[PDB]
Amino acid sequence: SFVKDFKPQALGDTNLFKPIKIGNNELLHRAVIPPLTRMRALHPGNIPNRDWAVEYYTQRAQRPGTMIITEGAFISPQAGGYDNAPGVWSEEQMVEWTKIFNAIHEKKSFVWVQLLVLGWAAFPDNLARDGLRYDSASDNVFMDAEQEAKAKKANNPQHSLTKDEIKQYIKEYVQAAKNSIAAGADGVEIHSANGYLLNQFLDPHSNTRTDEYGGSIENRARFTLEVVDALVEAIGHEKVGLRLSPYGVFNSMSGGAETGIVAQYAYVAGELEKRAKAGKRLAFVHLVEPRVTNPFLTEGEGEYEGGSNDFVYSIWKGPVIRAGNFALHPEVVREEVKDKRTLIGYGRFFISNPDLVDRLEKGLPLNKYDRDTFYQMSAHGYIDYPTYEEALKLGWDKK
């Protein structure tokens, strides 16, 4: 069905429908598919779904010139811990990714691989089964009681990374980025948001380290920036973006309750701008808005009103993608895109609307999403959401 009480607005008369170049890609509009974990990869081997993933991405690539960021993809076994999320370290994975990238490109759209390392958000028992560590910045602060207890029961207590282990992750990010480009991706996004490993280093709640990787703003940012630099060197700044969620609380990050949080993220933005001014400007910075501090919560819940991401624009002077409860708020998007370097990521409603871009241009009703199938091993709720035309044929204008 369509979302019941939504009053759509046509956004075709806004900068959402003006072209923009991101990295090497000439986008034809500024509605971006942000990374969306869907848990259809198959075990063993974290293989992108051999039956459905091509079709899923093909559907969502249908508007020419769309930028798609993939679901988070693990850079190595040690970076993982969800059996049904994909990786980008093996030949068998890349065979499937190549098909996905080719399909997106045949629709004249673009694809950026999000590179994911879980840290304390991983399942410690899956890691133990596979002989892998359960990693984070620290060893004395935990995501939650259940994770701590699972790790202990698995004889895999949370481990504070050594400097050598950090270097090994950086090597894996580099190789994963290389693999992505070689298989045909247009670029990569470094996931430093939503409480995953890099964010666990950025945040003073999760990072209690006293070495060069914690204990100050500069030190907490060090791992993220080392990954940025390593990828810029390996595949070029024009093929690298970075995702941040300054106000996020998902995965037990601090959010605005931490009075130093804006400074921490302002420092990162400043370091990116310094690199840009020195000739190595990232393709984009992707920000999760305080509009959504926790994406498990229905739109309108978990909104933090005590902060804005606008500070980033005073610092970083390149493209900015913003995501968080924008599909139901065309009035907010209409104002944000007046800034000429702002793109809008639409997450949950791109799950349920493969033709979302047409619907945004033309002010059409939106398909309601089905949260129950966000992570199910099924084509249902993955590749069977209708286009607007198909929905009319199903009678959804009268449901």
Ligand X SMILES: C=C(C)c1ccc(C)c(O)c1
Catalytic positions are: 196
**Minimum gap (Å) between residue 307 Cβ and Cl ion:** 29
The DSSP-derived string for 173-192 is: HHHHHHHHHHTT-SEEEEE-
User: Contacts with Cl ion: how many residues (CB under 5 A)?
Assistant: 5
**Contact call for residue 313 and Na ion (CB under 5 A):** yes
148: how many CB neighbours lie within 10 A of its CB? 17
Query: 347-366 mask for ligand FMN (x: CB under 6 A)?
Result: xx------------------
Nearer to ligand FMN by Cβ, of 80 and 324: the residue is 324
Q: How far apart are CA 365 and CA 318, in angstroms?
A: 33
**Residue 389 exposed, middle or buried by CB count within 10 Å (0-12, 13-18, 19+):** exposed
Name the binding residues: 37, 114, 191, 194, 243, 348, 375
Place of tokens 């990162």: 268
Is 181 buried (19+), middle (13-18) or exposed (0-12) by CB count in 10 A?
A: middle
The first and second tokens of residue 362, run together, are 């033309």
> For ligand X, which is the closer residue by CB, 27 or 198?
198
**By the rule CB under 5 A, 301 interacts with Na ion:** no
Site for ligand FMN in 331-350 (CB under 6 A): 346-348
Strand 67-69 and strand 73-74: the pairing is unpaired
Binding partner at 83 among Na ion, Cl ion, ligand FMN, none, C-beta below 5 to 8 Å by kind: Cl ion
Question: Which of 14, 15, 37, 224 is the binder for ligand X (CB under 6 A)?
Answer: 37
Q: Go through the chain and tell me how many residues it has.
A: 399
Q: Which does 37 bind (CB under 5 to 8 A by kind): Cl ion, Na ion, ligand FMN, none?
A: ligand FMN
Name the strand (E) or helix (H) holding 265. helix 261-277
Q: Site residues (CB under 6 A) for ligand X?
A: 37, 72, 116, 194, 196, 250, 295-296
Residues that bind Na ion (CB under 5 A): 9-10, 51, 313, 363
Residues that bind Cl ion in the complex, under the rule CB under 5 A: 3-4, 82-83, 368
